[PDB]
């Protein structure tokens, strides 16, 4: 599901909190 895929991506392809 989309939300699942998003929250999965959030630990896997993320950028918005590795700022620094």
UniProtKB/Swiss-Prot annotation:
Protein's recorded name: Hemagglutinin HA2 chain
Gene name of this polypeptide: HA
Section covered of the full-length record: 346 to 365 of 566
